[PDB]
Amino acid sequence: KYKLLVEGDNLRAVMATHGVKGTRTTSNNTYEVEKTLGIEAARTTIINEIQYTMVNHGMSIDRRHVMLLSDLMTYKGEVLGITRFGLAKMKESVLMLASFEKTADHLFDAAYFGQKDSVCGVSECIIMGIPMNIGTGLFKLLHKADRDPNPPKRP
């Protein structure tokens, strides 16, 4: 059987030509699947092209890790790559951005806006010295001692 691979980028102009069944054609550029084939196909390439390059190098990995990394990367509308720039479009809190790169601009710009951040995540609860709520700090514990909301006295 015959197929043909191209070294190009114009996807939907390739997908629409005569002879190519455009229902079965993929890319490896996850942006040109996002612009052309929706976000959900751009989720499946980020699953695939990581799980393709991970089994190529030996290096077995669960899909449930890549099913999380892809689903974080494309859940706010568009594919948000994990760079310095994609963190600004993913997170609201300042100190989690400020502990990452560009510490100067991210602290001044969030003083220009009156940015009220709550203290959540782990990159701020570690900075502030609060027990983080991720993991062992998710729930909280009660005590089971002898108590009751009692009757009062007659006044």
């Binding site: 782990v122 570690i126 010295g129 609060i130 027990p131 983080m132 709520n133 991720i134 993991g135 062992t136 700090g137």
Partner: protein, 60 residues
């Protein structure tokens, strides 16, 4: 030889500016639980450890 490299710091000098334990064994040490080992302590889910290991016994 391990005599030049054996090291432990219970509680000693802190740096004058940031009040963290100093860097070096010549200055009675304290070894940096770095931010890469922070994520290891995150991924275990140990929350009360990280408060103990980065607020209680470093900068209380």
């Amino acid at each position: 030889m391990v005599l030049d490299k054996m090291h432990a710091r219970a509680r000693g000098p802190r740096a004058v500016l940031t009040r963290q334990p100093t860097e070096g064994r010549s200055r009675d040490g304290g070894l940096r639980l770095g931010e890469m080992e922070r994520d290891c302590l995150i991924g275990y889910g140990a929350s009360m450890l990280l408060l103990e290991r980065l607020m209680i016994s470093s900068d209380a």
